[PDB]
Amino acid sequence: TYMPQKAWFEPYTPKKFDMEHQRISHNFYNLETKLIWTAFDTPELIGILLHDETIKGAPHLYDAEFLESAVHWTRESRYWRCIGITKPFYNKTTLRAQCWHDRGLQVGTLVFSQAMRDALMDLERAVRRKELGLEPNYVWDRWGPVGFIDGARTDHLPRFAHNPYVDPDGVEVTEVDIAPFNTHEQIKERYGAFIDPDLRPFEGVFRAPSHGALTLDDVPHQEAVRLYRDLMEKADMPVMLGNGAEIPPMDMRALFHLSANPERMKAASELSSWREVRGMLAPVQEVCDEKVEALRLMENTRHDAARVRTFYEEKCGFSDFMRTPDKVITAAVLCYLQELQRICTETDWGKPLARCLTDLERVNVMGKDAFLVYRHIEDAILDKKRRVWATRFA
Amino acid sequence: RPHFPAYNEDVDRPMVVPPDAICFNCDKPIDAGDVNSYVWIPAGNATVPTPQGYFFHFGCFKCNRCKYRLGHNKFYSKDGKAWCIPCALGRDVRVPTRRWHTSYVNTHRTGSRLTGHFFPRHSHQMEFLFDPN
Amino acid sequence: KNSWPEWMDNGADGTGYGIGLHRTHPLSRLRGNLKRSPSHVPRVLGMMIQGVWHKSGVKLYFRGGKPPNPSVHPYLTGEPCPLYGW
Amino acid sequence: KGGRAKFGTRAAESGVWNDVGGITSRVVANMEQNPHPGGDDFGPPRGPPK
């Protein structure tokens, strides 16, 4: 079997500083470097990073300035990744994307490598195909975290002259052709369509109610699901007797709000129709759905990386997070950052809720009913997973 | 000791470079006789494509799937493309220790010259000579 | 370990850039691999006479002909880098 | 001993008799084929700090 020998543990203690400049330099170095490396390698784990640093004693993480820096570094990290940069930092003082050679060909031209030149060759080939009108086959759109999305092949940059890239349409690119494209804005105005993601389809994803693969069978209150089915049958609409039925998330939100506290369930069961059952919950549900969704999107993403993967899959409809392309991944991460910014800014209660890390403090800052609903939902998820584990064991 | 003839006689069926001639991995035209940069594999067959032997470029005689050289200088034709035996049999991609993106092969059928069609070709061609008619 | 940096043993570049015996100024803060101890004389003589064979297939410090004189090399002035030359 | 008595199987026409004139360094530069042989820290930083 596998057995670890021993693991060390370090106590969480906030760093003390005698003067202000020391604290400024420390927070800059530590937090900025960690955030940039995260946004470069795996920008999804920014929430885990923020949670860990707040646990270690970083108070100013959930501020508007830090969140703006985070989204800016995420956008620039996507830009660098599309350029073909491997390491975000050339030195501890300056970034790698801000290195200009002097006394050479140009004094402000970014210092390019052969890998960056080949990536610009790919970009220019895609742009020339787009201009000719035929289907532009950008090679790195099928590139993901685990590797290529569909092709089990292996590719590596820079490509040599013995095994170069072949184009069935005959479009050719050359370093002599890319030579004028040397500055950041000049290459952005040309290859913007391939470096920038698309965040439009996600504008209403994080603000919409969702459940972690929860269905009517996994509802903890059999009486609640049966009374919901009886109301839907009293209404002139057909019902599905099978456990795997498609129920709307807005309706399942009210179902969980009912099943959380039994008083409201008994008060709503005597009503005539599910229409009235949702109407009587509408006033209290509006002031709690936003809060419970915010709490869920922060908790399920600040604890473990696998939970972040599952959350992103469930909310974006992705089949596999290792198979989905990196552009839409970056788009979803940026939209999640914008959602966190909205929660922190537009709502005054969001910043203390984000700073709170324990159940006691989250109950103190959150409505008791909303916390009960959220705990019931997450406990239903945990019960489903535990039943799956029991079926595995048996 | 070698047990194969030298200077194979093509009086029965001459093997000449055609005027029009494309590749197997590339389907692009090649040089006819000015440069031997192509690889000629003759077998004396009019079977499609490229009768009396297909042609390959030196750089492109490699496998088309894994883009690697050949093991024993033997390729596998797969729906118009040339694959390697590990690729055709379905085995995993094996990176060779020697040259990667080019194989050991001579130019202008020099490596495939010691085997093929020789003189006489058929049995009815010898009796044509030994008979007075 | 060694006092001199590790790029003098194996340069940071894949080609082996920055290989050889580097002399430093007495008042300088950088440190080189030119040492005259009875333990360092073997490797110094090896670099001077035999040279150094890199795994890429090239002799970096002394291919052949006239051997270099590390006592008269100009003083070391820095370190290599992948971005710029030096 | 094969062939010659002092030289053995080492034929005069094949190779050099003594390929060590003075000293020879058995070490080969970058024999480990590491991606970055400049040291533990050199040039760009590797991985996030702490």
Binding site: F40, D41, T42, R81, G84, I85, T86, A115, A119, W140, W143, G144, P145, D155, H156, L157, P158, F160, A161, H162, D326, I329 | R99, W100, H101, T102 | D13, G14, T15, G16, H54, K55, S56, G57 | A29, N30, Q33, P35, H36, G47
Partner: peptide
């Protein structure tokens, strides 16, 4: 580590030798 970026092989003496061979 886990890094989402373009496939980039480090410049290895073996890679330099293969390029010189080609």
């Amino acid at each position: 580590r886990e890094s989402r970026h373009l496939p980039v092989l480090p410049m290895t003496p073996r890679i330099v030798f293969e390029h010189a061979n080609e």
